[PDB]
Design a protein around this ligand. Structure first.
Ligand code: NI
Length: 341
């Protein structure tokens, strides 16, 4: 049965609530983004209205085979009416097609549901600034002070420089990037752009990218592995054994691999700046762990919330345990006392 934190009170709306079968009273199902924990339950068998971004709708039609009649795409930064209620979709700074949803309730309450997001100061100059928001449904993935990470730009600059040096030293080196879902495309697109290459991948991954409305995408990607010096592989294959196996498949055209594993936070964020990163190496294979995050850091989340000044916060991540809920409640109260709301 559907949790309270996926329901928007005083509407017939739900958000990311597809795994409970038919939700009693729901007239419109919103989907924030195309990550499987959020879409769980959606398939060609679904027959109720789904509201989402154009990119999310592309993926629902082509990958999950949801019938077109049930897909209702909405543009971004535009006031729209759904079932007699004013809504706005805003860029979440997460993966492609990911949104936050602003609900203007008939009684005058305003609710922001972040979906998954990486808070940014540019959000403080969006439509959110135009009126008071009363309730916030928050992506609390990294709601603890230990969670720091570098900017996306710092990480990309390190990746571009590392790959350019390795391939300039050895023109027979292949670059590999691991992936398991949409998101983090800039890692492999920026590396391929500095090397003057397309990115090579499986037919199933190419199909996914072709749904993302990336300008000039046909000049950037290919299914011809041979012709390209940056390859994508499942994240599970980015280890010494898998990368050796892959090198054997490529018909000797390469004699070395440099690989990237974009992760979330992992314990060592605590000590190491991006400039100090060194790879794990076994023979002619080197692997770099790079902390490229599409969720808010603690400091990013705290800045956004203290600017928004909500009257109530409803967490959407790490809500299954007491301990976790209690810890998050302590931080929200600190933030409120500090900023005076
Ligand atoms: Ni996500």
């Amino acid at each position: 049965t559907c949790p309270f934190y996926k329901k928007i009170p005083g509407t017939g709306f739900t958000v990311d609530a597809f795994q409970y079968g038919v939700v009693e009273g729901c007239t419109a199902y919103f989907l924030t983004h195309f990550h499987s924990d959020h879409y769980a339950g959606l398939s060609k068998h679904f027959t109720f209205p789904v509201y989402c971004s154009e990119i999310t709708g592309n993926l629902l039609k082509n990958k999950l085979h949801v019938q077109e009649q049930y897909i209702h795409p909405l543009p971004l930064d535009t006031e729209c009416i759904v079932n007699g209620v004013k809504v706005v979709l805003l860029d979440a700074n997460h993966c492609p097609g990911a949104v936050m949803i602003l609900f203007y309730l008939p009684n005058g309450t305003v609710i922001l549901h972040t979906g998954d997001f990486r808070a940014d100061p540019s959000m403080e100059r969006s439509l959110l600034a135009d009126q008071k928001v009363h309730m916030l449904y928050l992506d609390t993935t990294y709601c603890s002070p230990e969670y720091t990470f570098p900017s996306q730009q710092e990480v990309i600059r390190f990746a571009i420089n590392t790959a350019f040096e390795a391939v300039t030293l050895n023109p027979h080196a292949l670059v590999v990037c691991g992936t398991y879902s949409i998101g983090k495309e800039k890692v492999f697109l920026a590396i391929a752009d500095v090397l003057g290459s397309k990115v090579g991948m499986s037919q199933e991954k190419y199909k996914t990218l072709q749904c993302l409305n990336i300008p000039e995408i046909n000049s950037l990607i290919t299914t011809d592995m041979c012709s390209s010096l940056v390859h994508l592989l499942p994240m599970m294959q980015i280890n010494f054994k898998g990368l050796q196996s892959h090198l054997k498949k490529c018909g000797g055209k390469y004699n070395q691999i440099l690989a990237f594993r974009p992760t979330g936070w992992t314990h060592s964020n605590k000590f190491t700046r991006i400039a100090d990163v060194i790879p794990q190496t076994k023979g002619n294979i080197s692997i770099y762990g790079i902390p490229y995050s599409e969720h808010s850091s603690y400091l990013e989340m705290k800045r956004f919330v203290q600017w928004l000044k909500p009257q109530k916060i409803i967490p959407t991540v790490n809500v299954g345990t007491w301990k976790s809920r209690s810890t998050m409640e302590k931080y929200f109260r600190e933030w409120k006392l500090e900023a005076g709301y």
